[PDB]
Design a protein around this ligand. Structure first.
Ligand code: HEM
Ligand SMILES: *[C@@H]1O[C@H](CO)[C@@H](O)[C@H](O)[C@H]1NC(C)=O
Ligand SMILES: *[C@@H]1O[C@H](CO)[C@@H](O)[C@H](O)[C@H]1NC(C)=O
Ligand SMILES: *[C@@H]1O[C@H](CO)[C@@H](O)[C@H](O)[C@H]1NC(C)=O
Ligand SMILES: *[C@@H]1O[C@H](CO)[C@@H](O)[C@H](O)[C@H]1NC(C)=O
Ligand SMILES: c1ccc2ccccc2c1
Ligand SMILES: [Cl-]
Ligand SMILES: [Mg+2]
Length: 325
C-alpha cells in the first residue's frame, strides 16, 4: 500500500481502550527487540501474531503512540527493506517466520526485526547484543540497570538525561565485552533515537513531561503492555531531544576489531554530520547487498519501497537509485 499520511486528529487520547485490550501471547505470536511495536501488537493495533504490512505498522505507531509520520515512514521502510518480504509486503516484528511468505533468494535473509546487523544492533538498553546469544528478549539485568540509571540521573524516572548516561554506559559495556561490537551507520543513528522514544512516547500524553516512571517503563519494555488508562502523546513526535543524548557523551561511529576494548573509529561510517550519507549507504550497501541482482518482480518491489523510504528522508538529501528508475 501507499505509506499512510499523518493523523487527521493528533490529540492525546486513551489508546488502552475497549477496542485495544492487552492480551498475552498465544503460541506462535512473535515479539521482538522493539517495545513500541511489541506493545502495538499486544494491544491489537497491529496483528497480535506480530506479522504486519508496512502500512499497518505506520498506522499503528501513529494511532497508538502519536509517532510522527516522517519517522514512522523512514523506520518502517528501512526495517521492511532489510528484514521484510517485499513480494508479500509482510514484516515480522521478531523472529524469522514462514508467515512472511515465500523467501527471496540468498543473500536476502527476511529475518524479521530479530535479524542482527540489518536494523537491530548492539548496545540496546533492555536487550543483550546478539554476540551474547539473544538480541530480542527483555533482559531483567539490563532493565535493572535502566532503573538504576533512572534513580541516579532521573530522580527515579527515565528522561533524556538518563538516556544520555545509559546510551553511553551500554556502548562502553559493548566495547568491554563484545569483540564483534558494531556501532556504525544505521545502528549509530537509531541507537541514539531509540533512547528518546520512552521519554517522548511511553509518557502518558496528559503529562507529556518526558519523565517515564519505572512501572510504565517495565510494562512497555517487559510486558508490551500500556499502563491502565494510557493516553498517547498529545502531538506527533519521535526523536526530539536526541541532541541532549548525543551531547552528554559524543561518540564517533566505530567497531571492536575482533577483540574487546579495540574500539576503532570508521571514517567510512556516516555520523550526525553526514545524515544523507547514512541514507545513501543504507540503500547502496545494505539494501543492495541483500538484493545485488534482483529478478523483475523483486526489482519493482525494491524500487517502490525505496521510494517510500525516501519520503521518510529529511529534505536536503538526493534520492539514490541502486536499480535505476
Ligand atoms: C516505526 C516503526 C518502528 C520500527 C520499524 C522499529 C524497530 C525497532 C527495532 C528493530 C529496534 C531494535 C534496535 C536495537 O535496539 O537493537 C527498536 C528498538 C526500540 N524501539 Fe522501535 N521501531 C519502531 C517504532 C517505535 C516506536 C513508535 C517506539 C516507542 C513507542 C519505539 C521504541 C523503541 C525502543 C524504546 C527501542 C529500544 C529497545 C532497547 O534498546 O532496549 N519504536 N525499534
Ligand atoms: C480529536 O480527538 C480528541 C480526543 O479524542 C477529541 O476530544 C476531539 O473532539 C477530536 N477532534 C475532532 C476534529 O474530532
Ligand atoms: C542479560 O544481560 C546480562 C548482562 O549483560 C547477561 O549477563 C545475561 O546473560 C543476559 N541474559 C539473561 C537471560 O539474563
Ligand atoms: C531528569 O530528571 C532529573 C532529576 O529530576 C533532572 O535533574 C533532569 O533535569 C531531568 N532531565 C530532563 C531532560 O528532564
Ligand atoms: C550511491 O550510488 C549513486 C549512484 O548510483 C551515487 O550517486 C552515490 O554517490 C552513491 N552513494 C555512495 C554511498 O557512494
Ligand atoms: C526519527 C526517529 C528515529 C531516528 C533514528 C535515527 C536517525 C534519525 C531518526 C529520526
Ligand atoms: Cl506526523
Ligand atoms: Mg539490539
Amino acid at each position: 500500500g501507499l505509506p499512510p499520511g499523518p493523523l487527521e486528529n493528533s490529540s492525546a487520547k486513551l489508546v488502552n481502550d475497549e477496542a485495544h485490550p492487552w492480551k498475552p501471547l498465544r503460541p506462535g505470536d512473535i515479539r521482538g527487540p522493539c517495545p513500541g511495536l511489541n506493545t502495538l501488537a499486544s494491544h491489537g493495533y497491529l496483528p497480535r501474531n506480530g506479522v504486519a504490512t508496512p502500512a499497518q505498522i505506520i498506522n499503528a505507531v501513529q494511532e497508538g503512540f502519536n509517532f510522527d509520520n516522517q519517522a514512522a515512514i523512514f523506520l518502517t521502510y528501512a526495517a521492511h527493506l532489510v528484514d521484510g518480504n517485499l513480494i508479500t509486503d509482510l514484516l515480522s516484528i521478531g523472529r524469522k517466520t514462514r508467515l512472511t511468505g515465500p523467501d527471496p533468494p540468498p543473500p536476502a535473509s527476511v529475518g524479521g526485526l530479530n535479524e542482527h546487523g540489518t536494523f537491530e544492533g548492539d548496545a540496546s538498553m533492555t536487550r543483550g547484543d546478539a554476540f551474547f546469544g539473544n538480541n530480542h528478549d527483555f533482559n531483567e539485568t539490563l532493565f535493572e540497570q535502566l532503573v538504576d540509571y533512572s534513580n541516579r540521573f532521573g530522580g527515579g524516572k527515565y528522561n533524556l538525561t538518563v538516556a544520555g548516561e545509559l546510551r553511553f554506559k551500554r556502548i562502553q559495556d559493548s566495547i568491554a565485552t563484545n569483540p564483534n561490537f558494531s556501532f556504525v551507520d544505521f545502528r549509530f543513528f537509531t541507537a541514539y533515537g531509540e533512547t528518546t522514544f520512552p521519554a517522548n512516547l511511553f509518557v502518558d500524553g496528559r503529562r507529556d513531561d518526558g519523565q517515564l516512571d519505572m512501572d510504565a517503563a517495565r510494562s512497555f519494555f517487559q510486558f508490551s503492555r500500556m499502563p491502565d488508562d494510557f493516553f498517547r502523546a498529545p502531538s506527533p513526535r519521535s526523536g526530539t531531544g536526541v541532541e541532549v543524548v548525543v551531547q552528554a557523551h559524543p561518540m564517533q561511529p566505530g567497531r571492536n576489531v575482533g577483540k574487546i576494548n579495540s574500539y576503532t573509529v570508521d571514517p567510512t561510517s556516516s555520523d550526525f554530520s553526514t545524515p544523507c550519507l547514512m541514507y545513501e549507504k543504507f540503500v547502496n550497501i545494505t539494501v543492495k547487498s541483500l538484493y545485488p541482482n534482483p529478478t523483475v518482480q523483486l526489482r519493482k518491489a525494491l524500487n517502490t519501497n525505496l521510494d517510500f523510504l525516501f519520503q521518510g528522508v529529511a529534505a536536503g538529501c538526493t534520492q539514490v537509485f541502486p536499480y535505476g528508475r
